[PDB]
Amino acid sequence: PECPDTWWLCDCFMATCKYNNTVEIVKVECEPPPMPTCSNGLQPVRVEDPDGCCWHWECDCYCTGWGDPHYVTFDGLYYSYQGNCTYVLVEEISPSVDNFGVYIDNYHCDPNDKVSCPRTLIVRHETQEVLIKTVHMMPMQVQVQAVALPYKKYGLEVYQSGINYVVDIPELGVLVSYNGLSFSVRLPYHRFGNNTKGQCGTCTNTTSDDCILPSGEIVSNCEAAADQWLVNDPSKPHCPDCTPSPLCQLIKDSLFAQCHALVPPQHYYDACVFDSCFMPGSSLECASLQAYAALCAQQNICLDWRNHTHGACLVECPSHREYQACGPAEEPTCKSSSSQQNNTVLVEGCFCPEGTMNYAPGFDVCVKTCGCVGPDNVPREFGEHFEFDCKNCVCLEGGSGIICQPKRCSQKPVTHCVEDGTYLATEVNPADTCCNITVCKCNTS
Amino acid sequence: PECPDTWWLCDCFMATCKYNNTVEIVKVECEPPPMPTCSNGLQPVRVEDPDGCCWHWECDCYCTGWGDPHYVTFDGLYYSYQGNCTYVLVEEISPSVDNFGVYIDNYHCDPNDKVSCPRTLIVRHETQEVLIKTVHMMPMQVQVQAVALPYKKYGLEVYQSGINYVVDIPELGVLVSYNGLSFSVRLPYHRFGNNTKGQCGTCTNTTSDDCILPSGEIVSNCEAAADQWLVNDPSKPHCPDCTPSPLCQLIKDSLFAQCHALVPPQHYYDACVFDSCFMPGSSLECASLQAYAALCAQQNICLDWRNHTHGACLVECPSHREYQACGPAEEPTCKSSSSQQNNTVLVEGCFCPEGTMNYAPGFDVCVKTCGCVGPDNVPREFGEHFEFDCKNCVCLEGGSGIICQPKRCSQKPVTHCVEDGTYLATEVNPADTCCNITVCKCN
Numbered sequence: 039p040e041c042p043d044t045w046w047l048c049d050c051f052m053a054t055c056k057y058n059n060t061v062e063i064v065k066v067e068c069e070p071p072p073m074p075t076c077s078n079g080l081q082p083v084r085v086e087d088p089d090g091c092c093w094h095w096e097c098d099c100y101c102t103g104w105g106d107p108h109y110v111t112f113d114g115l116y117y118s119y120q121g122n123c124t125y126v127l128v129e130e131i132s133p134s135v136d137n138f139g140v141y142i143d144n145y146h147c148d149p150n151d152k153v154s155c156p157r158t159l160i161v162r163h164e165t166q167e168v169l170i171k172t173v174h175m176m177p178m179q180v181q182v183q184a185v186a187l188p189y190k191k192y193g194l195e196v197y198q199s200g201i202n203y204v205v206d207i208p209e210l211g212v213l214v215s216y217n218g219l220s221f222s223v224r225l226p227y228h229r230f231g232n233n234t235k236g237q238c239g240t241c242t243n244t245t246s247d248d249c250i251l252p253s254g255e256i257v258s259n260c261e262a263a264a265d266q267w268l269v270n271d272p273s274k275p276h277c278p279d280c281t282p283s284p285l286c287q288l289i290k291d292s293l294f295a296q297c298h299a300l301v302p303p304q305h306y307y308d309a310c311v312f313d314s315c316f317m318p319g320s321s322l323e324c325a326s327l328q329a330y331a332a333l334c335a336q337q338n339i340c341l342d343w344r345n346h347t348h349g350a351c352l353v354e355c356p357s358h359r360e361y362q363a364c365g366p367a368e369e370p371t372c373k374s375s376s377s378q379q380n381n382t383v384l385v386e387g388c389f390c391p392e393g394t395m396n397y398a399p400g401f402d403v404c405v406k407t408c409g410c411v412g413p414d415n416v417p418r419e420f421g422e423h424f425e426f427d428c429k430n431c432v433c434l435e436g437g438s439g440i441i442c443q444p445k446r447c448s449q450k451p452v453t454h455c456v457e458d459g460t461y462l463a464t465e466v467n468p469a470d471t472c473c474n475i476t477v478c479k480c481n482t483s
Numbered sequence: 484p485e486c487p488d489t490w491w492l493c494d495c496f497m498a499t500c501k502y503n504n505t506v507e508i509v510k511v512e513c514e515p516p517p518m519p520t521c522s523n524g525l526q527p528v529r530v531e532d533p534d535g536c537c538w539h540w541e542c543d544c545y546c547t548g549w550g551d552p553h554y555v556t557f558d559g560l561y562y563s564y565q566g567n568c569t570y571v572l573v574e575e576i577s578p579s580v581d582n583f584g585v586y587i588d589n590y591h592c593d594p595n596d597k598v599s600c601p602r603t604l605i606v607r608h609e610t611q612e613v614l615i616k617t618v619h620m621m622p623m624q625v626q627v628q629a630v631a632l633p634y635k636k637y638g639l640e641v642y643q644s645g646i647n648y649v650v651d652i653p654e655l656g657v658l659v660s661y662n663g664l665s666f667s668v669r670l671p672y673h674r675f676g677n678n679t680k681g682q683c684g685t686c687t688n689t690t691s692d693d694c695i696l697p698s699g700e701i702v703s704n705c706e707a708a709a710d711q712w713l714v715n716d717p718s719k720p721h722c723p724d725c726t727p728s729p730l731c732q733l734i735k736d737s738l739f740a741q742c743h744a745l746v747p748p749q750h751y752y753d754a755c756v757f758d759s760c761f762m763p764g765s766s767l768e769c770a771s772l773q774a775y776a777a778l779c780a781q782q783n784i785c786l787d788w789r790n791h792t793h794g795a796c797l798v799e800c801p802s803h804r805e806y807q808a809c810g811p812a813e814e815p816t817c818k819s820s821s822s823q824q825n826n827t828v829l830v831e832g833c834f835c836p837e838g839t840m841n842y843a844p845g846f847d848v849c850v851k852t853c854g855c856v857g858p859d860n861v862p863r864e865f866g867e868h869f870e871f872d873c874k875n876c877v878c879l880e881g882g883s884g885i886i887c888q889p890k891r892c893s894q895k896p897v898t899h900c901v902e903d904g905t906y907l908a909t910e911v912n913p914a915d916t917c918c919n920i921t922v923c924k925c926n
């Protein structure tokens with residue numbers, strides 16, 4: 039009567055077993071209304087229950103830090119802390135993964151404040167460590183050893199999305215984004231809930247306990263708790279009227295009208311004012327604008343704000359790409375055109391013009407026809423015979439864009455050598471530098 | 484009481500109803516015995532039912548053709564047809580996929596019967612046609628213009644596996660493998676059941692109805708009906724003693740003992756005898772051994788035949804590749820070593836040595852460790868600086884591993900010069916061919 043295996047059946051049909059061939063079945067179904075607040079103000083995600091029929095809403099853990107001193111913790115709490123040693127951003131209170139740590143090193147690279155090194159982001163996962171450190175205009179990644187942009191190894195991926203260098207762990211769902219002036223840490227609540235620590239605080243959905251010391255007790259003065267998260271290192275062992283600029287008024291302006299809802303602008307406006315007061319006229323005051331716009335874009339609300347700032351800070355990327363305030367997070371590459379489960383959250387950055395498109399990940403030349411591109415960034419077309427390197431090559435469409443078979447030429451000598459000191463001179467041929475000639479040529483002796 | 488969907492429940496449960504809660508649960512589960520024998524004699528594959536109740540055994544439609552005249556239909560009927568124009572292997576009686584046809588072309592790649600150029604096949608799927616031709620030891624493919632080996636476009640893929648160049652349609656399940664002396668067409672039964680037509684016959688699991696003329700007909704001489712399928716197009720529009728050598732005896736030898744079961748060897752032995760009789764002393768008899776071994780490997784009994792052929796039929800590829808008779812169909816390749824999961828039945832063919840491995844698809848350099856390889860087929864190491872195409876280049880792991888930056892050649896100019904007739908000379912730098920420093924040569 040009670041079933042031989044009153045028992046939860048497949049497809050959520052818990053059944054009350056009257057008998058083996060007749061039962062008293064019950065449907066299971068659960069619809070929760072969207073979680074009202076998440077305390078960070080970002081929209082909740084529906085995370086499914088272990089039973090497929092039911093589901094729930096959980097808050098994403100989002101930490102953001104812009105400019106030099108400013109940071110918002112996983113639960114929205116905003117605080118300004120300045121320091122020099124590498125400070126830990128997030129770790130795991132009860133270690134699940136082998137090494138998981140996103141660590142910031144602000145000015146530890148250099149005491150002076152410049153794009154040479156505002157800060158460097160170190161994401162350490164298991165055996166790997168990724169060190170994104172902005173050397174002037176372009177950050178370069180050092181992995182344990184420099185690497186390229188679309189890196190992928192041991193479940194850790196690194197890629198450039200818009201103006202943000204993204205280090206992600208799909209198995210953990212961890213997305214870390216580094217910009218010149220801003221850093222973001224996004225963690226699933228289910229995987230890292232009430233299990234995180236550091237300057238980004240504890241993801242518990244209440245702002246009250248988002249300031250835990252390495253010891254683990256919390257404090258009210260959240261700014262002081264941040265210094266206690268120092269990551270000790272052998273180097274630097276000690277590791278010890280303002281005018282409201284009109285630019286700062288852009289936060290409260292009608293441009294960000296859609297942003298004033300679903301995202302609180304008070305913190306960013308205060309950060310802008312404080313940065314303007316820190317020293318005027320150093321173009322550091324428009325870092326808060328960038329992150330306010332980025333968070334608005336995260337809320338599926340894309341804005342163009344930079345042309346409104348009357349200059350004084352724009353993007354610095356080469357001429358073959360144009361700045362777009364609203365664009366795909368993953369630009370459409372010809373080689374890798376695919377589903378890509380587009381988030382369609384439109385990010386800002388600079389992309390290839392409308393007519394052309396990017397060739398492939400890891401490349402930067404924009405092309406019209408898809409073609410093939412060689413180590414030198416030059417568009418080739420399918421079927422084009424050319425002579426790259428010193429070898430004749432073809433650009434067929436297939437597994438390898440360029441066959442590049444070896445050139446068919448050689449040095450040309452003279453056997454007769456009938457003149458005083460006629461010697462085979464291997465002078466480089468102007469048409470083919472490698473295909474030179476070694477003809478017999480009279481020398482003085 | 485009437486169930487508000489008496490119903491087939493989830494996970495193939497079933498029920499009838501007395502109340503929606505009070506239901507009369509059933510369960511449907513079963514395991515039919517294997518299809519004992521299919522006309523092809525290949526092991527039938529496990530084809531799932533639309534629901535989750537049970538499954539069944541459906542044999543794959545396998546058509547093989549080796550040598551010049553020899554064919555075996557989708558149902559194990561062997562025949563020998565000689566032709567000079569392009570012919571249709573398999574089409575659809577009722578067209579369900581647009582322009583889907585596999586067409587053979589004999590005596591047009593070259594009129595040649597030996598491995599250098601036996602024939603060409605043209606696989607047409609929708610907007611695409613793949614023309615695999617083989618010129619001497621190297622088969623080349625033309626797609627609509629030539630293409631590379633790991634070609635992929637519009638759901639149609641071409642690669643090479645072992646000695647066989649594979650054109651497949653994963654959506655349709657169609658597989659087509661050309662080696663110079665053989666081809667094989669594999670079609671799933673459910674997708675192409677009694678809908679096929681051509682020289683490969685109808686896939687009905689019965690040999691009897693295999694032979695049809697273009698117009699629906701049943702003629703018992705499959706050989707004679709093969710001529711009727713001729714596809715004519717603007718190309719070539721005018722288109723219309725024997726010593727029993729031991730080499731063929733190798734089929735019946737104890738080497739193929741595992742093959743004599745699960746695979747009938749009568750057809751291949753007769754084909755070898757006939758090929759020897761057509762003209763002896765030309766090694767056209769090693770095509771039947773090759774395909775017998777290929778079929779055995781399909782059925783898991785992989786054997787080496789070439790070694791005991793006493794030097795008659797051997798494979799060829801450059802020195803960096805060694806012949807391993809039972810090796811992976813998908814080569815372990817460093818780029819995309821993702822534990823590529825494929826049928827673990829090992830194919831014959833030549834691979835990189837056990838110490839090294841193939842670098843990436845479309846490449847041929849057997850890298851030891853891993854690295855980048857340039858357009859020039861030179862192995863590179865991670866974090867290595869070289870000078871290629873007159874640009875400083877670094878091989879570093881990531882995307883587009885070779886990152887090459889322009890020369891940046893700082894020629895320092897020798898210009899104030901004193902000697903008889905010393906003129907400023909921007910001669911090409913001996914140290915760097917790319918640099919042409921001013922060195923100020925005299926007369």
Ligand SMILES: *[C@@H]1O[C@H](CO)[C@@H](O[C@@H]2O[C@H](CO)[C@@H](O[C@@H]3O[C@H](CO[C@H]4O[C@H](CO)[C@@H](O)[C@H](O)[C@@H]4O)[C@@H](O)[C@H](O[C@H]4O[C@H](CO)[C@@H](O)[C@H](O)[C@@H]4O)[C@@H]3O)[C@H](O)[C@H]2NC(C)=O)[C@H](O)[C@H]1NC(C)=O
Pocket residue numbers: 073074075076077096097242243244
């Ligand atoms: C962590 O958890 C989640 C996010 O993960 C968040 O909590 C959920 O939402 C609220 C937080 O505000 C929790 O508490 C409830 O708040 C309601 C507020 O409603 C007021 O405002 C609306 C505006 O329209 C008015 O209409 C309304 O009249 C109120 O003025 C309260 O109304 C709720 O009270 C009811 O529910 C509780 C709990 O069942 C009952 O005890 C009450 O008697 C009454 O029926 C309630 O106080 C809510 O509980 C959380 N939901 C879930 C599913 O957990 C938070 O960010 C965070 N921390 C908290 C506080 O949980």
Ligand SMILES: *[C@@H]1O[C@H](CO)[C@@H](O[C@@H]2O[C@H](CO)[C@@H](O[C@@H]3O[C@H](CO[C@H]4O[C@H](CO)[C@@H](O)[C@H](O)[C@@H]4O)[C@@H](O)[C@H](O[C@H]4O[C@H](CO)[C@@H](O)[C@H](O)[C@@H]4O)[C@@H]3O)[C@H](O)[C@H]2NC(C)=O)[C@H](O)[C@H]1NC(C)=O
Pocket residue numbers: 517518519520521522688689690
């Ligand atoms: C397509 O693929 C199918 C499945 O593999 C094959 O069709 C069957 O496969 C058998 C196996 O060879 C074929 O041969 C004969 O099967 C008879 C089955 O009869 C029993 O099973 C059926 C139900 O399936 C019952 O109704 C019946 O009462 C029996 O219990 C056998 O009886 C035959 O035996 C005779 O021939 C063999 C040699 O082949 C002798 O050794 C025996 O002594 C006896 O004389 C025989 O085995 C047959 O075509 C199909 N039968 C089945 C099992 O369904 C086809 O081979 C394949 N291609 C074709 C042509 O359809």
Ligand SMILES: *[C@@H]1O[C@H](CO)[C@@H](O)[C@H](O)[C@H]1NC(C)=O
Pocket residue numbers: 231232233242
């Ligand atoms: C889990 O989170 C709650 C707050 O939501 C906290 O009070 C509790 O101590 C946490 N426990 C763990 C497992 O850390």
Ligand SMILES: *[C@@H]1O[C@H](CO)[C@@H](O)[C@H](O)[C@H]1NC(C)=O
Pocket residue numbers: 342345346
């Ligand atoms: C210039 O500014 C306007 C808003 O005032 C904006 O709509 C436009 O896209 C900007 N163009 C640029 C970026 O030059």
Ligand SMILES: *[C@@H]1O[C@H](CO)[C@@H](O)[C@H](O)[C@H]1NC(C)=O
Pocket residue numbers: 370376377378379380381
């Ligand atoms: C993303 O957009 C592309 C077109 O740009 C489309 O082909 C692809 O299917 C989309 N993927 C998803 C699921 O967003």
Ligand SMILES: *[C@@H]1O[C@H](CO)[C@@H](O)[C@H](O)[C@H]1NC(C)=O
Pocket residue numbers: 466467468469470471909910911916917918919
């Ligand atoms: C300059 O260098 C190129 C490349 O090596 C060579 O072909 C050419 O002859 C040299 N001379 C000049 C000045 O053109």
Ligand SMILES: *[C@@H]1O[C@H](CO)[C@@H](O)[C@H](O)[C@H]1NC(C)=O
Pocket residue numbers: 447448449450464472473474475
């Ligand atoms: C050209 O000169 C090089 C040396 O720079 C020599 O190795 C080569 O054999 C010569 N012949 C060719 C290829 O023209």
Ligand SMILES: *[C@@H]1O[C@H](CO)[C@@H](O)[C@H](O)[C@H]1NC(C)=O
Pocket residue numbers: 576676677678
């Ligand atoms: C296939 O065979 C079935 C009978 O099993 C028949 O009804 C159907 O019409 C046949 N289809 C073709 C086109 O051969």
Ligand SMILES: *[C@@H]1O[C@H](CO)[C@@H](O)[C@H](O)[C@H]1NC(C)=O
Pocket residue numbers: 787790791792793
């Ligand atoms: C190699 O050849 C000899 C003669 O063919 C034979 O005895 C031996 O079994 C062969 N070994 C294999 C299978 O490689």
Ligand SMILES: *[C@@H]1O[C@H](CO)[C@@H](O)[C@H](O)[C@H]1NC(C)=O
Pocket residue numbers: 810811812813814815816822823824825826827828829
């Ligand atoms: C394809 O099959 C081979 C044969 O064992 C097996 O190694 C693996 O499944 C595939 N090869 C690789 C490593 O890609």
Ligand SMILES: [Ca+2]
Pocket residue numbers: 113239240241242243244245246247248
């Ligand atoms: Ca918290």
Ligand SMILES: [Ca+2]
Pocket residue numbers: 558684685686687688689690691692693
């Ligand atoms: Ca048939």
